[PDB]
Design an enzyme around this catalytic site. Structure first.
Site, PDB file in Angstrom:
ATOM      1  N   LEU E  38       0.594  -1.248   0.301  1.00  0.00           N
ATOM      2  CA  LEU E  38      -0.232  -0.397   0.153  1.00  0.00           C
ATOM      3  C   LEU E  38       0.760   1.312  -0.321  1.00  0.00           C
ATOM      4  CD1 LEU E  38      -3.198  -1.039  -0.153  1.00  0.00           C
ATOM      5  CD2 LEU E  38      -2.325  -2.244   0.677  1.00  0.00           C
ATOM      6  N   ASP E  39       0.438   2.838  -0.419  1.00  0.00           N
ATOM      7  CA  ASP E  39       1.290   3.496  -1.108  1.00  0.00           C
ATOM      8  C   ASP E  39       1.322   4.099   0.819  1.00  0.00           C
ATOM      9  OD1 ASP E  39       2.454   5.893  -1.301  1.00  0.00           O
ATOM     10  OD2 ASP E  39       1.078   5.578  -2.863  1.00  0.00           O
TER      11      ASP E  39
END
Ligand SMILES: NC(=O)C1=CN([C@@H]2O[C@H](COP(=O)(O)OP(=O)(O)OC[C@H]3O[C@@H](n4cnc5c(N)ncnc54)[C@H](OP(=O)(O)O)[C@@H]3O)[C@@H](O)[C@H]2O)C=CC1
Ligand code: SF4
Ligand code: SF4
Ligand code: SF4
Lengths: 176, 288, 114, 208, 80, 156
Positions: E38-39
């Protein structure tokens, strides 16, 4: 060298102060304004009967963008591209070829009547006055595409009159 | 071929695309949207109008300069139509009226018009003759309008058989007819598809030759009940042959080329429903 | 080499500013999409906003990153105002294709577009 | 040489020359060039750090008032590492003369928001921000004047071409006026006029 | 009624409300940045979702100090 | 016979009543606005042709687009163009409006109001003569004469 206004007092004498009070409370100068408006109401107005009368103009008025030609002669233009060189919207487009007879010619002379800002620069730049600012101002075109004049369009435009154009040039070749 | 027909650069706003399209009708719904897609593509449209010039004059500026040409015609004479299709690349016919007139039946406009214009199309030697029709317009009963349109289908296949008879389902849009009848105020299978899917399919089929001879039918992506459609159009929103057609049936016919043979994505109901349902309670039943 | 920056001492203040600005953009979506009377789902517009943020991802100098923060700040000002109408909000969207993909062959048919 | 040639005078020339030398003496901290034009309008080329000290000095100091703020634009010049030029024009009210403060800058490094000293600076500042891109230090409001709200690119630059990348037109499909990429009908024939033979030999820069 | 287990259960159902995570996988030492992919953009999405659901300001450096749902529960139970 | 005759004379009467007054609104951005207010001059009348300028769009049947229409302006132009009755007529006046014209280049300027609205009368000029503008208005009234709306509605 200065002349300023509104620096004067209202007089504190009873005379002028009740004269201004009469102006305030009695509606005097507004009725004087009514009298001024009636004085101009009883004139005869400066209108024109528009389909029958056409107003004043100048001999140097810049309208139609029409062409001329020589006395019993050829087409007046040269395709020397000065009008395209000075046209402030690049509304002139001259694609030019010579015919085989030796006299230099064109192919396609193009004026964007949409883009013309109506200077007079193409009149004052043409050495032979081929493109002439025209005398009449009646275009009123219903369609968009018809505002794009071609060469034979301007030739048939010049074929309807020159004597008006020659009269304006004959009155206006000495001031310029 | 001759020059000034081959494409040049991008599309739109007096671009030189590949096609020249003569459209019949075009004052109403789908022809106007197709003129707008041709101006988006940047082609030249030949539209003959029989109506008042105010209508074609306020739908005039949809293209650029040179992109349109207007002319005049009657639905009785072959000379004006041949003058219309003198130098024509492709030609489409869109026709349809809700009630008959004193001078026109449902027959002989759907008969006498495509006979004459298909006749001068085949005489003029053109390509991509595209004639519209309606879904499940039977030869058989339940609709005078649909049987007359089926006679029109049969005649378009009859004369110049290298054509595209194209039928959508009951399409909806910004100026839909039947949904306007639904809004402003039994069992029925139905699947409506939105207008831009249909007209994108038309412009794809008219810029993709090899399509001559094939017939098309378009599918709504939901396949649900008319009563749930009424539920939705009043949930948000808070003639006799027309109502009998919309209460008849609207089924699928998977045996002629439809959507994915053309390779186009269908658009759903709810997006364009929230669009046109101006002036969130989404049913979305979709039985099979 | 001595050049004055805009605001920051490293990229940490720049990341701080841009993620606070994106939080303001995310909370700024639903009020304006109900107010502007739009027709595009909240997921699609939010994904396009985060995709536009991810478009400029190859920038490392903090001056430029703070300048883009100032750009998006002015944008969020003009959208929290009702100055911008439906036109510019739809102009962020790209619905007027222009369909040309990165095929060599689709570039071969519609020529001169490498 | 006598008729029809524009008359100039040595009086205003000597006055402005001595005044510019005087200002350069009394502020040795930011003055670089004091050039006196032959038509007697002073230009002073300036470093971009003491801009607000220069403006507070030139609003006042009782030997030359200069209460009048005027033209300022950071005129777009390429080829220089310090591209843009902030030229604050000042006009007096008691002494009738015109001085120009040409301080230099580049694109990214900001000038220091002259609204703190002059009340008429704000819309000029916001204009230069939307048009060139010259950023300010402790500035009240940076909005967009004279451009579209969706438009970008700082279009006065030499980076920006004649046309844009937007073209508005209405469609009834999506029922609005959308912006498309450009579709020009006319070439905009750029008539090249740079003829040779060096009409002004006195302004020739020395070659290699 | 604000129990630590109540905070953990409400964090659990709002991560279930979060769509992109695959699967839910309530790990007390997850670190879905580099262990799930995930960013930091998605990180600030998740922490502002916590900010939406159950309370306080949560400035973004404190948002960076969480990185993991059980530590979010620990920080809010310390904070609420 | 009598039906077509009644439709013809009634359409003549109602179109004559249309082209009778036609009181417009004045959009008028740049110096073509001064030319519109000088066809509102005392010398070149408007009262004689039933024209009285009134910026209320609820009754403005004809509308004159004059001045440099810009890309910053034009959506509000179509917004005012929307709420307007079923016959609506457009006079593109001026080089700025008849195609963009002199500013046919120069970004954030529309290349003429054709890209936004239809145009029912084009009148070129920079500035157009107000007399020429009034001539175009009389040609607009003769277009109103040449509509045969009720005749098309009957022969449908
Ligand atoms: N779901 C739907 O809406 C469906 C639509 N269609 C087709 O979509 C098109 C548009 O439909 P719609 O807008 O509802 O109806 P319209 O009447 O508005 O569209 C038909 C077009 O053809 C013209 N036309 C039709 N009949 C005649 C005639 N007898 N003489 C001259 N012109 C005629 C119309 O008027 P004018 O002559 O003034 O140009 C118009 O331009 C039609 O072709 C219809 O068959 C088909 C199936 C389903
Ligand atoms: S200036 Fe005159 S002669 Fe020369 S190209 Fe133009 S019209 Fe022809
Ligand atoms: S008067 Fe018209 S055609 Fe002639 S130079 Fe000027 S803009 Fe061009
Ligand atoms: S066309 Fe000419 S007169 Fe009219 S607004 Fe434009 S610049 Fe002014």
């Amino acid at each position: 060298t200065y002349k300023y206004v509104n620096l004067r007092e209202p007089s504190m004498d009873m005379k002028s102060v009740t004269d201004r009070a009469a102006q305030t409370l009695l509606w005097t100068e507004l009725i004087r304004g009514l009298g001024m408006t009636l004085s101009y109401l009883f004139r005869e107005p400066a209108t024109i009967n528009y389909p029958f009368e056409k107003g004043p103009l100048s001999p140097r008025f810049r309208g139609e963008h029409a062409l001329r030609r020589y006395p019993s002669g050829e087409e007046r233009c040269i395709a020397c591209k000065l009008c395209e060189a000075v046209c402030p919207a690049q509304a002139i487009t001259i694609e030019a070829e010579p015919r085989a007879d030796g006299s230099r010619r064109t192919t396609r002379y193009d004026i964007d009547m949409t883009k013309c800002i109506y200077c007079g620069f193409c009149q004052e730049a043409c050495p032979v006055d081929a493109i002439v600012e025209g005398p009449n101002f009646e275009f009123s075109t219903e369609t968009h595409e018809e505002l794009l004049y071609n060469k034979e369009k301007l030739l048939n435009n010049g074929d309807k009159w020159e004597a008006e154009i020659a009269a304006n040039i004959q009155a206006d070749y000495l001031y310029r | 071929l001759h020059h000034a027909v081959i494409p040049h650069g991008k599309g739109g706003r007096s671009s030189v695309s590949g096609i020249v399209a003569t459209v019949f009708g075009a004052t109403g719904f789908l022809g106007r949207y197709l003129v707008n897609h041709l101006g988006r593509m940047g082609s030249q449209v030949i539209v003959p109008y029989r109506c008042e010039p105010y209508d074609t004059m306020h739908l005039r500026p949809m293209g650029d300069l040179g992109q349109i040409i207007f002319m005049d015609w009657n639905g009785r004479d072959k000379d004006s139509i041949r003058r219309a299709v003198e130098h024509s690349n492709v030609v489409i016919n869109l026709v349809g009226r809700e009630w008959e007139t004193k001078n026109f039946d449902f027959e002989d406009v759907f008969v006498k018009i495509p006979q004459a214009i298909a006749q001068v199309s085949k005489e003029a030697g053109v390509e991509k003759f595209i004639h519209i029709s309606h879904l499940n317009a039977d030869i058989k009963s339940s609709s005078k309008y649909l049987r007359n349109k089926a006679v029109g289908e049969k005649e378009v296949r009859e004369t110049f058989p290298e054509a595209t008879i194209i039928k959508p389902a009951d399409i909806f849009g910004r100026e839909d007819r039947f949904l306007n009848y639904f809004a402003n105020i039994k069992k029925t299978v139905k699947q409506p598809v939105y207008i831009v899917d249909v007209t994108k399919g038309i412009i794809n089929a008219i810029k993709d030759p090899d399509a001559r001879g094939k017939t098309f039918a378009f599918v709504g992506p939901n396949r649900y009940l008319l009563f749930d459609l009424v539920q939705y159009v009043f949930a948000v929103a808070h003639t006799r042959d027309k109502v009998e057609r919309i209460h008849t049936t609207d089924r699928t016919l998977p045996h002629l080329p439809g959507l994915e043979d053309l390779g186009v994505q269908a658009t759903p109901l709810e997006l364009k429903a929230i669009e046109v349902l101006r002036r969130s309670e989404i049913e979305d039943v979709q039985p099979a | 080499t001595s050049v004055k920056p805009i605001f920051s001492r490293d990229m940490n203040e720049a990341k701080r500013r841009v993620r606070e600005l994106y939080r303001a953009w995310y909370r700024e979506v639903p009020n304006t999409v109900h107010l502007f009377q739009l027709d595009i789902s909240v997921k699609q517009g939010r994904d396009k906003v985060r995709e536009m943020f991810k478009k400029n991802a190859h920038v490392t100098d903090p001056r430029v990153v703070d300048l883009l923060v100032i750009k998006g700040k002015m944008e969020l000002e003009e959208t929290i105002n009702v100055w911008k109408q439906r036109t510019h909000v739809m102009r962020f969207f790209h619905e007027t294709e222009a369909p040309r993909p990165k095929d060599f062959l689709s570039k071969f048919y519609v020529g001169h577009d490498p | 040489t006598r008729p029809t040639v524009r008359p100039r005078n040595d009086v205003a020339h000597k006055q402005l020359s001595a005044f510019g030398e005087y200002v350069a003496e009394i502020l040795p901290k930011y003055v670089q060039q004091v050039q006196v034009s032959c038509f007697s309008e002073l230009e002073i080329c300036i470093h971009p750090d003491g801009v607000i000290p220069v403006l507070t000095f030139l609003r006042d100091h009782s030997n030359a008032q200069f209460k009048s703020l005027a033209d300022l634009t950071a005129v777009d010049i390429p080829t220089r590492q310090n591209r843009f030029e902030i030229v604050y024009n000042l006009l007096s009210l008691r002494f009738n003369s015109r001085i120009r403060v040409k301080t230099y800058t580049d694109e990214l490094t900001p000038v220091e928001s002259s609204v703190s000293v002059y009340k008429a600076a704000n819309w000029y500042e916001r204009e230069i921000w939307d048009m060139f891109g010259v950023f300010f230090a402790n500035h009240p409001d940076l909005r967009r004047i004279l451009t579209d709200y969706g438009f970008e690119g700082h279009p006065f630059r030499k980076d920006f071409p004649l046309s844009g990348y937007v073209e508005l037109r209405y469609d009834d499909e999506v029922k609005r006026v959308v912006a498309e990429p450009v579709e020009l009908a006319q070439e905009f024939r750029k008539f090249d006029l740079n003829s040779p033979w060096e009409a002004f030999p006195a302004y020739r820069q020395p070659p290699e | 009624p604000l129990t630590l287990e109540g905070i953990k259960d409400r964090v659990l159902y709002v991560l279930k409300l979060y769509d992109k995570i695959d699967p839910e996988k309530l790990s007390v030492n997850s670190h879905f940045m580099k262990d799930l992919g995930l960013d930091s953009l998605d990180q600030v999405e998740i922490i502002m979702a916590m900010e939406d659901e159950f309370g306080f300001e949560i400035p973004d450096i404190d948002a960076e100090k969480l990185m993991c749902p059980q530590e979010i529960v620990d920080y809010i139970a310390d904070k609420k | 016979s009598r039906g077509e005759y009644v439709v013809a004379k009634l359409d003549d009467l109602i179109n004559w009543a249309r082209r009778s007054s036609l009181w417009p609104m004045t959009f008028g951005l740049a110096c073509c606005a001064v030319e519109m207010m000088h066809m509102a001059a005392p010398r070149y009348d408007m009262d004689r042709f039933g024209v009285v300028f009134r910026a209320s769009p609820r009754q403005s049947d004809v509308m004159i687009v004059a001045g440099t229409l810009t890309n910053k302006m034009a959506p509000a132009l179509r917004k005012v163009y929307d709420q307007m009755p079923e016959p609506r007529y457009v006079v593109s006046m001026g080089s700025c409006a008849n195609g963009g014209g002199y500013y046919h280049y120069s970004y954030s300027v529309v290349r003429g109001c054709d890209r936004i609205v239809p145009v029912d009368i084009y009148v070129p000029g920079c500035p157009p003569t107000a007399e020429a503008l009034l001539y175009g208005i009389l040609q607009l009234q003769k277009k109103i004469k040449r509509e045969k709306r009720l005749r098309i509605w009957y022969r449908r």
